[PDB]
Amino acid sequence: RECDYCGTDIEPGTGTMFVHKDGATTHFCSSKCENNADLGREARNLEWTDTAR
Amino acid sequence: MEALGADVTQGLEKGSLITCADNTGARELKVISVHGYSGTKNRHPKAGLGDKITVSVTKGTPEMRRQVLEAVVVRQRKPIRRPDGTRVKFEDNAAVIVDENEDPRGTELKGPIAREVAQRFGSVASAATMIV
Amino acid sequence: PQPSRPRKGSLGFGPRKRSTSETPRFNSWPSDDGQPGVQGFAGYKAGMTHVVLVNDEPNSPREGMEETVPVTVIETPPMRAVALRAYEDTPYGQRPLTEVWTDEFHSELDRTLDVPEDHDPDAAEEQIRDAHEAGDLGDLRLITHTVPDAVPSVPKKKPDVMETRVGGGSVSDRLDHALDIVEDGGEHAMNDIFRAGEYADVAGVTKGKGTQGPVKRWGVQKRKGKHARQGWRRRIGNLGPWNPSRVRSTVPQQGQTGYHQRTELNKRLIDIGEGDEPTVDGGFVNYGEVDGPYTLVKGSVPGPDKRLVRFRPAVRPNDQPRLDPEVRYVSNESNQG
RNA sequence: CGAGUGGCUUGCUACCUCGAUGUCGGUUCCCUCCAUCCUGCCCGUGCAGAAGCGGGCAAGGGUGAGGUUGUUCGCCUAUUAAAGGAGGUCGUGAGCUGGGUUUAGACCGUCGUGAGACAGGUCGGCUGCUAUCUACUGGGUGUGUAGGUGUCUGACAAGAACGACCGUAUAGUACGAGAGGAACUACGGUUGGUGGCCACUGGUGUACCGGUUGUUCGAGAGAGCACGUGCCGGGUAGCCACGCCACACGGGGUAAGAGCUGAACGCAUCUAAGCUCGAAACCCACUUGGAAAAGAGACACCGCCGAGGUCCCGCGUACAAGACGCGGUCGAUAGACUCGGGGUGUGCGCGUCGAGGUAACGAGACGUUAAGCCCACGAGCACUAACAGACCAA
RNA sequence: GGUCUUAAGGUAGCGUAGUACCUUGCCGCAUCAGUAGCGGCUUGCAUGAAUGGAUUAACCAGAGCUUCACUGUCCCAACGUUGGGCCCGGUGAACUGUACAUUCCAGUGCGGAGUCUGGAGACACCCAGGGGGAAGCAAAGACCCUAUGGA
RNA sequence: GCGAAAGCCAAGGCCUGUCGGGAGCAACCAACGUUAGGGAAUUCGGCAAGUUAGUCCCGUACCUUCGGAAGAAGGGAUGCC
RNA sequence: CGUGGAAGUCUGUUAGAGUUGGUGUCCUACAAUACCCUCUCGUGAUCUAUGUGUAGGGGUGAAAGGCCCAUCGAGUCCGGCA
Ligand SMILES: CO[C@H]1C[C@H](O[C@H]2[C@H](C)[C@@H](O[C@@H]3O[C@H](C)C[C@H](N(C)C)[C@H]3OC(C)=O)[C@@H](C)C[C@@]3(CO3)C(=O)[C@H](C)[C@@H](OC(C)=O)[C@@H](C)[C@@H](C)OC(=O)[C@@H]2C)O[C@@H](C)[C@@H]1OC(C)=O
Ligand SMILES: [Cl-]
Ligand SMILES: [Cl-]
Ligand SMILES: [K+]
Ligand SMILES: [Mg+2]
Ligand SMILES: [Mg+2]
Ligand SMILES: [Mg+2]
Ligand SMILES: [Mg+2]
Ligand SMILES: [Mg+2]
Ligand SMILES: [Mg+2]
Ligand SMILES: [Mg+2]
Ligand SMILES: [Mg+2]
Ligand SMILES: [Mg+2]
Ligand SMILES: [Mg+2]
Ligand SMILES: [Mg+2]
Ligand SMILES: [Mg+2]
Ligand SMILES: [Mg+2]
Ligand SMILES: [Mg+2]
Ligand SMILES: [Mg+2]
Ligand SMILES: [Mg+2]
Ligand SMILES: [Mg+2]
Ligand SMILES: [Mg+2]
Ligand SMILES: [Mg+2]
Ligand SMILES: [Mg+2]
Ligand SMILES: [Mg+2]
Ligand SMILES: [Mg+2]
Ligand code: NA
Ligand code: NA
Ligand code: NA
Ligand code: NA
Ligand code: NA
Ligand code: NA
Ligand code: NA
Ligand code: NA
Ligand code: NA
Ligand code: NA
Ligand code: NA
Ligand code: NA
Ligand code: NA
Ligand code: NA
Ligand code: NA
Ligand code: NA
Ligand SMILES: [Sr+2]
Ligand SMILES: [Sr+2]
Ligand SMILES: [Sr+2]
Ligand SMILES: [Sr+2]
Ligand SMILES: [Sr+2]
Ligand SMILES: [Sr+2]
Ligand SMILES: [Sr+2]
Ligand SMILES: [Sr+2]
Ligand SMILES: [Sr+2]
Ligand SMILES: [Sr+2]
Ligand SMILES: [Sr+2]
Ligand SMILES: [Sr+2]
Ligand SMILES: [Sr+2]
Ligand SMILES: [Sr+2]
Ligand SMILES: [Sr+2]
Ligand SMILES: [Sr+2]
Ligand SMILES: [Sr+2]
Ligand SMILES: [Sr+2]
Ligand SMILES: [Sr+2]
Ligand SMILES: [Sr+2]
Ligand SMILES: [Sr+2]
Ligand SMILES: [Sr+2]
Ligand SMILES: [Sr+2]
Ligand SMILES: [Sr+2]
Ligand SMILES: [Sr+2]
Ligand SMILES: [Sr+2]
Ligand SMILES: [Sr+2]
Ligand SMILES: [Sr+2]
Ligand SMILES: [Sr+2]
Ligand SMILES: [Sr+2]
Ligand SMILES: [Sr+2]
Ligand SMILES: [Sr+2]
Ligand SMILES: [Sr+2]
Ligand SMILES: [Sr+2]
Numbered sequence A: 001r002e003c004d005y006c007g008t009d010i011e012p013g014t015g016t017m018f019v020h021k022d023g024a025t026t027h028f029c030s031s032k033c034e035n036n037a038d039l040g041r042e043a044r045n046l047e048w049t050d051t052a053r
Numbered sequence B: 001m002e003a004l005g006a007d008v009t010q011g012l013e014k015g016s017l018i019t020c021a022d023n024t025g026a027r028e029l030k031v032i033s034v035h036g037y038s039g040t041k042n043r044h045p046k047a048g049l050g051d052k053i054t055v056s057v058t059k060g061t062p063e064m065r066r067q068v069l070e071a072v073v074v075r076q077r078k079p080i081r082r083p084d085g086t087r088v089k090f091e092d093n094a095a096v097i098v099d100e101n102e103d104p105r106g107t108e109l110k111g112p113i114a115r116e117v118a119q120r121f122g123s124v125a126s127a128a129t130m131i132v
Numbered sequence C: 001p002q003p004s005r006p007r008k009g010s011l012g013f014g015p016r017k018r019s020t021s022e023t024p025r026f027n028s029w030p031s032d033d034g035q036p037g038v039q040g041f042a043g044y045k046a047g048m049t050h051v052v053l054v055n056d057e058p059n060s061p062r063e064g065m066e067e068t069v070p071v072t073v074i075e076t077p078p079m080r081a082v083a084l085r086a087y088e089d090t091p092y093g094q095r096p097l098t099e100v101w102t103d104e105f106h107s108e109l110d111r112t113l114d115v116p117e118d119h120d121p122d123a124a125e126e127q128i129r130d131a132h133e134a135g136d137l138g139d140l141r142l143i144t145h146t147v148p149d150a151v152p153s154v155p156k157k158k159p160d161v162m163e164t165r166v167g168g169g170s171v172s173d174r175l176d177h178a179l180d181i182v183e184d185g186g187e188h189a190m191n192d193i194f195r196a197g198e199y200a201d202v203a204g205v206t207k208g209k210g211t212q213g214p215v216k217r218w219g220v221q222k223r224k225g226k227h228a229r230q231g232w233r234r235r236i237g238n239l240g241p242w243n244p245s246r247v248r249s250t251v252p253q254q255g256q257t258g259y260h261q262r263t264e265l266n267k268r269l270i271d272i273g274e275g276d277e278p279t280v281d282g283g284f285v286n287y288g289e290v291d292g293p294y295t296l297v298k299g300s301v302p303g304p305d306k307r308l309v310r311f312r313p314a315v316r317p318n319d320q321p322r323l324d325p326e327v328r329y330v331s332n333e334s335n336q337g
Numbered sequence D: 001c002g003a004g005u006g007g008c009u010u011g012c013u014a015c016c017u018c019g020a021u022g023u024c025g026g027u028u029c030c031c032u033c034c035a036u037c038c039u040g041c042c043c044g045u046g047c048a049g050a051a052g053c054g055g056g057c058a059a060g061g062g063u064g065a066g067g068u069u070g071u072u073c074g075c076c077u078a079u080u081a082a083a084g085g086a087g088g089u090c091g092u093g094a095g096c097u098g099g100g101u102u103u104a105g106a107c108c109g110u111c112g113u114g115a116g117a118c119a120g121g122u123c124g125g126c127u128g129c130u131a132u133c134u135a136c137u138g139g140g141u142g143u144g145u146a147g148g149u150g151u152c153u154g155a156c157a158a159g160a161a162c163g164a165c166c167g168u169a170u171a172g173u174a175c176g177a178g179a180g181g182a183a184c185u186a187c188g189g190u191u192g193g194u195g196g197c198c199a200c201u202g203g204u205g206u207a208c209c210g211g212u213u214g215u216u217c218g219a220g221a222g223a224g225c226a227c228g229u230g231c232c233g234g235g236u237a238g239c240c241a242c243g244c245c246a247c248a249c250g251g252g253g254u255a256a257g258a259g260c261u262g263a264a265c266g267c268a269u270c271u272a273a274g275c276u277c278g279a280a281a282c283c284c285a286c287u288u289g290g291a292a293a294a295g296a297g298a299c300a301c302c303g304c305c306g307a308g309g310u311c312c313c314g315c316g317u318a319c320a321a322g323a324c325g326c327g328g329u330c331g332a333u334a335g336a337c338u339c340g341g342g343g344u345g346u347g348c349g350c351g352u353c354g355a356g357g358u359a360a361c362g363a364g365a366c367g368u369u370a371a372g373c374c375c376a377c378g379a380g381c382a383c384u385a386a387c388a389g390a391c392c393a394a
Numbered sequence E: 001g002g003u004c005u006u007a008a009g010g011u012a013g014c015g016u017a018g019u020a021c022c023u024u025g026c027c028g029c030a031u032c033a034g035u036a037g038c039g040g041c042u043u044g045c046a047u048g049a050a051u052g053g054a055u056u057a058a059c060c061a062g063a064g065c066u067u068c069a070c071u072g073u074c075c076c077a078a079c080g081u082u083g084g085g086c087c088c089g090g091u092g093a094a095c096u097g098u099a100c101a102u103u104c105c106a107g108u109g110c111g112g113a114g115u116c117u118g119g120a121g122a123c124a125c126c127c128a129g130g131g132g133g134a135a136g137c138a139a140a141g142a143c144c145c146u147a148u149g150g151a
Numbered sequence F: 001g002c003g004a005a006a007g008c009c010a011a012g013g014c015c016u017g018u019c020g021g022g023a024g025c026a027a028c029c030a031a032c033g034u035u036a037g038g039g040a041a042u043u044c045g046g047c048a049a050g051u052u053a054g055u056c057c058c059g060u061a062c063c064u065u066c067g068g069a070a071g072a073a074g075g076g077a078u079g080c081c
Numbered sequence G: 001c002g003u004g005g006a007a008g009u010c011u012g013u014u015a016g017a018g019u020u021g022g023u024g025u026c027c028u029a030c031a032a033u034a035c036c037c038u039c040u041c042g043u044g045a046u047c048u049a050u051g052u053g054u055a056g057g058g059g060u061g062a063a064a065g066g067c068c069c070a071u072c073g074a075g076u077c078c079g080g081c082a
Helices: A031-038 C121-133 C173-184 C225-229
Strands: A016-019 A025-028 B017-020 B026-034 B052-060 B068-075 B087-089 B094-098 C042-054 C066-075 C079-090 C093-100 C137-145 C162-167 C199-205 C261-273 C294-298 C308-310 C327-330
Touching: A016 A031, A025 A031, B017 B052, B017 B068, B026 B068, B026 B094, B052 B094, C042 C261, C042 C294, C079 C121, C079 C173, C093 C121, C093 C137, C121 C137, C121 C173, C137 C173, C162 C173, C261 C327
Parallel strands: A016 B087, B017 B094
Antiparallel strands: A016 A025, B017 B026, B026 B052, B052 B068, B068 B094, C042 C066, C042 C308, C042 C327, C066 C294, C079 C093, C079 C137, C137 C162, C199 C261, C199 C308, C261 C294
């Protein structure tokens, strides 16, 4: 699987899956991504992210 | 009961104010007890995903309010561990009111449900919109 | 009416003092069933990583599905069985009779032992056989050491010597099997004793935590509410009643925690192999790199990295062995992150 | 109606203490009793089944969360296998708390001429001590056993190391007109307890990196202070739980009980001799400790002019002193350096753009730049430091 | 009862009261559950008019209760920071002391024993700890009674 | 900055709120920081802690002795160039 | 609508005064009444320095039997007093 935030490959047997109010599902590779998402930051704008580069 | 097929870290306690994921007329539920649970000294009785709890209606329609009904914990904020090691967390803590035969009191279920609840309470699953 | 509650901590692992030997000593051994063999092996703890498996259990609804299992990596290089000790049945229990040694010794065994120069392996062997004729021979055990030199991440070269039991067929046939291993060079591997999928008992001397208080040592409560701010935070209510006018040994007190021998039961051997397949990226934190004979044990194992852990076939297994589990993936992802 | 057991209540007595044995209730932490609430094995039934009712053995384990009340007691709620009772100076203030009783202030009611009273109510109203001895928890040093190293033995000691529940198949079956509705067994999980461990999730992380306010060092750059991080964001290692792993079965002998053979007493009789069974209880099994077990142990090897040990040096898988463990050039023990693996999030400078402004000037944007800075981990690497050397010892 | 004591015989109001013994009074509100709180009733053990009654805006480190918000008060504890604590140099008290003293389980005794009796256990010395016991230390009991005591 | 406020810094004073050295420095204690999910279940009692917060604009209930209640409540805004 | 700027008014660690809770720290103290956080007043019946007056069954007391030099339901010293 791939991270629905940064875009890197989520190491199997790792990660968290957040379920939204409407039903939408968002997989995360780490807490770093989760916390960056909670700050309202979009992955496109951050340079360390695989989506950007 | 039947195995959930996941490891649950209980996110609710006796007295917790949770959401009523149905069209019964009940808006906010308050946990009173948990079915088949027996704790230890000083420990607040814990409830979580897949547990059949006993609840009182805090908010809602004048007719549904103050009633002592049974429910099933559909969603919870604290992560649960699935067989593949992946953790799953929800937006809110939610429950659906149930009757004596483990069938939903209402007709339509609001919001998503966990696939683990499907194995224990079937008629709640076959009434669910989204199953994650 | 004051609610009931179980006592804080177990009285079975007492006294909670420091271990005499850092190398674990088994007090129980398996029953004599099949073909003669050494009832145990040993290695050095490396660290933890997860492995993906296919569900072996026939009674599981998930039989055949993908499943993540936490696994501890232990480096298990070949050990050397340098002697055969024999015990005799006396009216005072079992007592050692004689020992049969060898000529071939590992280059650095002299760092622990006063290596034998002049020994009679024949007269020793004779005393054991004349004792078996008399019907006085108890059990048959081998003196065994480890080659920490074979493990690059472990600082020590000084071998950890320990005795292991040989059980199996008849006392006559296992005497022969025992002598046969020794007479060569005493070299044996984990493949000789264990097979992947079997349940083993892992012994170990725990992580030393020095002196700790009751809350950590015995898991008593902390002072709650208003009591918590008075000058007493992590101290118990009382040391006992008025009468008896003494403090019982059962009341939770401070002292040594950790560095205790623990024998953890029913540990599944997920995989036995060789090479660098289970090593983590950047090396195992506070250990090193794995490249050689290893063993993947399901879950936790007592003790920290670099410590010697002992193996034994389960004396009391719960499930029936489901041999050679399918390994879909072993994680090599860094333990730093 | 009659005979008793207990010493939890109350009452009596006035033996003990008035040169003081700190109160009630609660809390915390430990041990116990059985007159047993649950769980195990039983017997009866107004025992079809299911759900009960009553009784026997039985103290292993369990007996929980809450609303009013200072309460104990008790009332009430929802859960539960059940939410038993009692003793330990009405266990526990050189442990806590201080809500009540019961100081000095004050009010109300009643009584009193009055001061003032009340076995009436009410608001406020203090918690001392550096442990000599003993006791226990853990830690050392010596002596005895009479040179050392390594491996063991097991007298005894500790354990609840495990208790309990729900579900599935058995089965809509046995049973029952029907309603209703089991079990043996096999499985899956949960809860409480226990021990351990950190790959995963989570926490911390005043290591580190970034943002940013105020002020100071002229600006820039780069920094200090703002309580022991200014605040905000992220967070490695480690330590942790909210995370993860593991914690039988079976034997042996019994209790209540069900029986066998069997006499006294030709018969009958489970008992008197004998025997077969039979509890979560006991013993073993399993875990932990344990040569100071005074019968002070066993084996193997090394050594008695030398085996081994101590100090020394570099360090931790160890650690409050002490102890323990490893390494010491025949070396990777620690540090430097370089990689690898990680944290942060794109450095100073310069170029372009930049709302504007005559210009000066200009917050900020893009590029250079997965940049810059940083690392409690790993590897490579004898470069640096493990040198020199002292002591004891049959 | 349809007067009598002793002059009169509770009027407005308030009322289970900071006053109500019975008492957690009864009904209601509120909570899953409310000896609490508020409202009503109220025969008031033993309310009541300057011994002031009722009532009341504003004020209050005054007493009781409810809600939103908040949170390590709690479930249930973890990690961290600073000063101690531990080891070393220097300085250097006090409390307390009839004697003996390694205790433990029972018993006995002025009925609450380290010392008596019986057994059990116990090799000596030292470090750290939290305080079970010495009916621990501290103050000739501030309760109670007594004194042909005191104020 | 509203300020004789905080915080930072001069001038001036001081390192004499006068014993030091060592251990990643343990238990335990004093002050204190951060803690997931829950959110007063704690307790006699939210004790302790936390929450909120400055300024401007909008807006403001019962009651009232008309003064007050009232910063009621609630909503929005806030930098730099 | 503006002006005016009243008050035993409000906010306020301005100076200053006070002392609610923590029943924290201390409790052979730093201290025979201390330390820290919290809290109250802060234009007035305000707070304060210095001088001055009232004396022991007497003062002083917005009253707590409060205070009158660590002494108060009758100060302290010496005497009566062995
Ligand atoms: C019971 O409340 C105590 C509270 C407190 O206890 C004393 C102190 C403990 C008191 O000791 C207790 O006194 C009670 C009257 C009797 C009690 N005994 C029955 C046991 C006695 O011991 C106790 C209660 O443990 C106190 C009298 C001790 C002492 C030596 O006499 C004394 O006077 C010293 C100068 C103490 O100062 C004062 C004013 O007491 C000081 C040492 C301080 C620092 O210590 C104390 O203050 C502690 C807080 O003061 C006492 C006078 C109270 O007695 C009563 C009946 O209320
Ligand atoms: Cl409950
Ligand atoms: Cl407590
Ligand atoms: K007394
Ligand atoms: Mg409790
Ligand atoms: Mg990690
Ligand atoms: Mg990760
Ligand atoms: Mg009985
Ligand atoms: Mg018992
Ligand atoms: Mg309670
Ligand atoms: Mg008592
Ligand atoms: Mg005591
Ligand atoms: Mg004390
Ligand atoms: Mg009170
Ligand atoms: Mg009171
Ligand atoms: Mg006290
Ligand atoms: Mg009332
Ligand atoms: Mg009148
Ligand atoms: Mg005492
Ligand atoms: Mg007296
Ligand atoms: Mg008196
Ligand atoms: Mg008199
Ligand atoms: Mg929390
Ligand atoms: Mg408060
Ligand atoms: Mg004057
Ligand atoms: Mg008076
Ligand atoms: Na204290
Ligand atoms: Na006591
Ligand atoms: Na009797
Ligand atoms: Na009595
Ligand atoms: Na008490
Ligand atoms: Na029992
Ligand atoms: Na109660
Ligand atoms: Na007592
Ligand atoms: Na006290
Ligand atoms: Na008490
Ligand atoms: Na049996
Ligand atoms: Na006032
Ligand atoms: Na805290
Ligand atoms: Na003591
Ligand atoms: Na104060
Ligand atoms: Na006088
Ligand atoms: Sr009790
Ligand atoms: Sr052994
Ligand atoms: Sr043993
Ligand atoms: Sr206190
Ligand atoms: Sr006694
Ligand atoms: Sr029963
Ligand atoms: Sr409560
Ligand atoms: Sr009582
Ligand atoms: Sr009662
Ligand atoms: Sr009180
Ligand atoms: Sr009274
Ligand atoms: Sr009362
Ligand atoms: Sr001797
Ligand atoms: Sr069934
Ligand atoms: Sr049916
Ligand atoms: Sr049928
Ligand atoms: Sr600082
Ligand atoms: Sr019988
Ligand atoms: Sr010996
Ligand atoms: Sr009347
Ligand atoms: Sr009045
Ligand atoms: Sr101490
Ligand atoms: Sr006195
Ligand atoms: Sr200066
Ligand atoms: Sr000095
Ligand atoms: Sr943080
Ligand atoms: Sr409350
Ligand atoms: Sr606002
Ligand atoms: Sr004023
Ligand atoms: Sr107080
Ligand atoms: Sr004091
Ligand atoms: Sr405080
Ligand atoms: Sr003010
Ligand atoms: Sr005199």
